[PDB]
Structures are given as C-alpha cells and as structure tokens.
C-alpha cells in the first residue's frame with residue numbers, strides 16, 4: 252500500500268543541463284514492486300526509467316529498463332547516427348531455494364559504449380569499462396556441489412569487446428570427504444567452453460580434474476598440514492588458419508595435456524605472553540612457514556582465456572597459485588614465511604595486530620620459454636590498530652625486488668561515533684612498474700602513472716538540525732582532484748532534505764592532455780549515506 | 795611466567811545453525827571449527843550447549859581509485875558476516891566480521907578478472923571464518 256507519486260527531485264549537470272525526476276510507485280503485490288520515472292534532460296531528451304522488484308522462493312531480484320528515444324547530442328560510435336535511442340537493461344537475482352538450490356544473476360547490457368558517460372544509473376558509472384552478464388544455477392549439499400554458469404561481458408571499446416572471451420557454458424563441481432582414514436579429501440572439476448567474437452581468435456574446450464589429499468594435524472597451540480594435489484587438464488583448441496599464419500602469434504596445439512603434481516607443507520605456531528609493565532594485556536607471536544613445490548611444464552602451446560596475474564597481499568603470500576583461471580600453472584619451489592603479532596586487552600579484544608611475511612625462491616618460477624632470479628624476492632605486510640572505541644587505523648604494503656622495491660601500499664584511518672559523526676583519511680599507492688606487470692594492456696606511465704591518491708570523507712552535525720558531508724580525493728602526481736563532493740542536509744520532525752554538489756573526473760582529452768570533469772548540483776528530499784554513496788568513489792565504512 | 799609459552803577457545807562442542815547450511819561460507823566455518831578441535835553436533839531441542847548462529851552475509855564491490863581518464867583503477871571487495879553466540883548460562887552475544895580485498899580492474903581481460911574475483915571471494919570467506927573462531931574468545935572471557 253503506497254501506489255502514488257513520489258516527491259520529485261531535480262538537478263543541474265554540466266553535460267545535460269537541467270534535469271528533472273518524477274518517480275511513480277505502483278505496488279503490485281506484497282512481493283512485487285514497480286517504479287516508473289520520467290527523467291527530463293534539458294539538452295538530451297526525455298528518458299524513462301523502469302524498475303521492477305520481486306521476492307520469490309527461488310530468491311529476490313530487481314529488473315530495470317531505461318529508455319531514451321531521441322538523443323540530440325550523441326551522434327554515434329562511428330561518429331554518425333543522429334537521433335539515436337539510448338537504452339539499458341539490468342537484471343539482478345540472488346537466492347537459495349529449498350536450501351540446496353542456488354540461483355544468481357548479474358546481467359547488464361547497454362546500447363552503446365558511451366551510455367554511463369552520458370546517462371546516470373544505479374547500475375553503472377563513468378568508471379566502468381564494461382558491463383557484466385552472468386547467470387548461475389547450481390545444486391549443493393553437505394558432501395558435494397555443482398554449478399552451471401554463463402559468463403559474458405560487454406566491453407566499452409570495439410577492440411575489447413571483440414577480443415573478450417566468454418565462458419559459455421562453465422561447469423564447476425566439488426566433492427568433499429572428511430576422515431578418509433587420517434586424511435581429508437577434496438576433488439574439484441571443471442568443464443568450460445571459451446569463445447570470442449573475433450573469428451581470428453581460437454576457440455577452446457577445457458576440461459580439468461584436480462584431486463587433493465590432506466593430512467591435517469591440529470592442536471590448541473599451532474597446527475601443521477601436509478597436502479598432495481594433482482592438477483590434470485586437457486585442452487581442445489580450435490585454431491583458425493589466419494591465426495596460425497601470423498608473424499606475431501604463438502604456435503598453439505590442437506590437443507594439449509598438462510599433468511602437474513603439487514606438494515605443499517604448511518605449519519603455524521602460536522606463542523603468547525602477559526605483557527610486563529602493562530598488566531592484563533596479552534601479546535601473541537605467531538610464526539608460519541610453508542614449502543611449495545610444483546614441477547615445470549612448458550605451456551606456450553596453450554592460449555590465454557580466463558587467466559591473469561593474481562594480486563598478492565600478505566595473505567596471498569601463502570596462496571599456492573600465481574595466476575587465475577587454469578591456463579598457466581607456474582612452477583613452484585619456494586618457502587613462504589610470515590610472522591604475526593597480536594595484542595589483546597582486559598576484555599579479550601584484539602586491539603593491535605601486525606603481520607610481516609616473505610617468499611624465498613630456490614629456483615625461478617616459469618610457465619614457458621618466453622623469458623633478479625632467486626632468493627627472498629617478495630615481501631608483504633599489513634597492520635591494524637584499534638586506537639579507541641571509535642577510532643581505527645589500518646594499512647598494508649608490498650615489495651617485489653624484480654619490479655623495483657615497493658609496488659603497492661595503502662593506509663586508512665577512520666573515526667565514527669554513530670551514524671551522524673564520521674571522519675576518514677586514506678592514501679593509496681601503486682608503482683607504475685607494478686601496474687605494467689600485474690595488468691598489461693594498460694602499462695607504464697604513458698600518461699598513466701601508478702596510483703598516488705589521498706582521500707578524505709566526513710559527515711558531521713553542525714547545528715540543531717543541520718548536517719554536512721564532504722568527500723575529497725586528490726591525485727598527487729598529476730596534482731589534481733579525482734573526485735569531490737560537498738553536501739548539506741536539513742532535518743525537522745519529519746525526515747530530511749538534501750542539497751549537494753559533485754565534481755569528478757569523467758573523461759580524458761587526448762590533445763594537449765588534461766582531464767575532462769563534470770559538475771552536478773541537485774536537490775532531493777525522499778540522506779547522508781545516500782549522498783556519501785553516490786560518487787565514483789563511494790563511501791565504504793572501514794573496519 | 796613472563797616470556798613466551800605455547801598455548802591459545804577454551805570450552806568445546808557447539809551447535810551450528812546457518813541461513814545457508816550448504817553454502818561456501820558455512821563450509822569454511824565448519825573447516826575452521828574442525829581445525830580448532832570443535833565437535834559440531836546435531837542435537838538441538840535439549841540445548842545446554844553453546845550455539846553459533848550465522849544470521850546472514852553480504853558482499854559488496856566499489857571503486858576505490860581511478861586513473862587520469864576517469865576509468866577505475868583499483869576495486870575493493872567487501873564481505874560482511876553477522877553472527878550470534880547463544881550460551882544457555884546467560885544472554886546472547888552478537889558478532890560481526892568484515893573482510894576486505896583489493897585488485898586492479900582490466901576491461902581487456904574481464905573474464906580473467908571475474909575468475910580472480912571468485913578466488914578472492916573464496917579467500918575472504920575463509921578469513922571470515924578464522925576471525926569468527928577467534929572472536930569466540932571474546933565471547934568467553
């Protein structure tokens with residue numbers, strides 16, 4: 252029961268001029284909702300935004316259709332369409348039916364690459380480089396589970412969309428069994444079909460089986476775990492002739508077998524003590540060591556489908572995989588060691604925490620022949636500190652000798668009393684070389700440096716029924732704001748009124764460098780967090 | 795006696811209820827309880843044993859940094875888990891766990907990235923479980 256109009260809202264943007272929102276709420280059933288919203292845009296046209304929410308036994312979900320008939324600005328991707336129709340379709344679903352059935356949908360499709368640049372939606376932003384289209388249905392009980400999936404992506408560049416691989420379909424299966432004698436056993440399996448739009452690119456069917464036997468020895472203090480794993484993979488790669496006769500392309504093989512055994516031994520111990528002058532507090536000292544061995548296997552005859560360099564933080568030090576997917580299994584012959592100290596107080600609250608770890612390589616990690624070689628090459632650390640009941644601090648850093656010392660680092664401090672008072676400082680750094688290594692096809696600093704971003708966010712009451720929010724993010728190398736948000740709120744017996752300004756980097760001018768910004772200043776009534784969660788860098792509460 | 799000794803949940807044996815008993819999070823929690831020598835039984839009805847109730851969990855993903863051209867640089871995955879510890883001796887002690895991960899985005903390798911995300915999520919779930927078990931200490935005291 253609510254089927255009326257909703258109080259309108261308005262705004263003024265640097266790209267669409269004056270904008271006017273007039274929402275209408277339907278209320279079809281206790282478990283069905285709809286919203287139809289004319290959205291006038293001075294310079295662009297009249298948009299219609301439809302949102303349909305449902306709640307059923309297979310799960311809860313939301314569908315959405317945005318439709319703008321006659322765009323008077325857009326022209327085309329090709330530079331020439333004129334009077335084109337802008338549209339967006341969204342479907343999200345999540346649910347566990349009858350405890351054993353599992354359904355998940357994350358589908359987004361737009362009419363053109365420049366949609367989110369020009370139009371505002373809850374299902375996208377100017378930071379997005381593509382749209383995700385994923386369907387997932389699976390069964391699961393205590394002993395095993397299986398999952399069928401369709402994974403496809405709409406990349407907002409011709410090149411990206413053309414060469415973007417799809418998983419269609421993907422089958423993931425897991426079988427578990429404890430107490431198989433002294434061991435715990437686990438078998439994982441996968442069957443996938445990778446295809447892409449570009450006819451030149453190879454298609455592939457990949458099958459993978461991976462049994463794992465585990466000997467876990469646990470205690471009140473410390474624990475050790477021995478693990479034997481078998482990685483078995485078969486590839487059926489269909490390779491077009493045009494691909495094989497390229498002067499720059501790798502010689503792929505039609506049928507590929509890869510079988511690699513993996514040995515891992517991982518141990519951890521927990522010392523502790525009552526601190527001396529400070530009585531009641533406890534300091535814990537937790538050493539951890541892991542040896543990993545995987546033999547080398549040349550995999551140049553396998554193409555890349557779903558495989559990228561995984562990003563390692565302090566935890567990732569003890570991860571047995573370097574890459575994602577299954578197209579590259581690096582040889583391993585290394586020891587990862589780490590030390591974790593904790594501090595508990597009177598009430599057994601973890602108040603301080605610090606971890607430092609490292610990886611020592613006995614031999615080079617390889618995946619092929621396409622080649623600062625051994626020793627302690629990777630370092631990583633993180634830290635957390637509960638300064639008081641309302642103030643928190645945490646941060647982390649990563650080093651790789653092969654990429655020139657420091658690669659990643661970040662720190663964030665946050666104060667918060669209730670949900671009216673909040674302050675947050677943060678800094679993020681990423682070396683150029685790290686970006687060039689971890690995510691290629693977006694390399695060294697050709698105008699694209701590493702990351703060095705300082706950020707502040709706040710929400711504070713200032714008068715009797717007044718409230719102000721702010722958010723400033725600054726790029727220190729380019730010496731310019733990345734994002735900025737200033738806001739006021741007014742309260743009375745009723746609820747709240749919100750007024751806000753926002754200026755963000757939204758594009759790039761190719762000639763004579765410089766970045767393209769956009770302005771927004773608007774009003775709604777229908778706050779605080781709702782305004783904090785609106786920019787390209789929305790507020791996420793730390794801790 | 796002053797310097798380092800080896801020890802460190804006192805009390806064992808509990809009930810385990812969850813909104814998603816066959817979900818991956820519940821599996822991680824079971825693995826972790828099992829690693830800490832906690833016997834997970836089927837009793838209910840005649841409680842007089844502490845219980846661990848997983849109310850629910852939510853996942854989040856936002857952009858935390860951008861490049862000069864406005865495109866996303868680093869993305870952050872967030873896992874929230876809400877739990878409750880019911881001890882028959884006294885009242886209920888609520889628990890909450892938040893886990894964070896960060897990775898660079900790459901529109902030219904979207905599928906790969908999705909894969910990466912899944913891995914991350916897995917790890918995060920595991921980490922959550924760990925904290926939960928450790929937080930049982932806070933419940934004890």
Ligand SMILES: CCCCCCCCOCCOCCOCCOCCO
Pocket residue numbers: 431432433464465466477478479
């Ligand atoms: C392979 C990874 C871990 C192995 C390292 C230690 C192996 C020691 O275990 C010996 C294996 O023998 C197990 C057979 O035990 C009997 C199983 O059936 C008894 C159940 O009633």
Ligand SMILES: CCCCCCCCOCCOCCOCCOCCO
Pocket residue numbers: 475516517518519540541542586
């Ligand atoms: C110049 C190359 C060799 C010189 C230094 C080699 C050092 C090798 O010794 C490393 C000691 O650690 C061995 C593995 O650590 C044990 C891990 O597994 C135990 C589980 O608790």
Ligand SMILES: CCCCCCCCOCCOCCOCCOCCO
Pocket residue numbers: 542547584613614
């Ligand atoms: C088939 C390709 C040829 C590659 C074989 C190279 C073999 C070189 O092995 C060097 C081994 O380095 C010694 C590692 O030290 C042992 C540490 O691990 C001890 C486990 O606790």
Ligand SMILES: CCCCCCCCOCCOCCOCCOCCO
Pocket residue numbers: 594596602603636638639640641
């Ligand atoms: C509102 C709650 C009370 C907060 C007051 C702080 C009480 C003191 O206990 C703090 C325990 O944490 C230890 C501090 O951690 C050390 C960090 O700095 C050491 C590194 O040089």
Ligand SMILES: CCCCCCCCOCCOCCOCCOCCO
Pocket residue numbers: 634644645646647648657659660661662663680
């Ligand atoms: C306990 C006081 C300080 C602890 C705060 C947490 C910080 C831990 O992580 C540090 C990460 O800081 C990033 C390193 O700074 C990068 C800039 O230097 C790069 C050189 O160009």
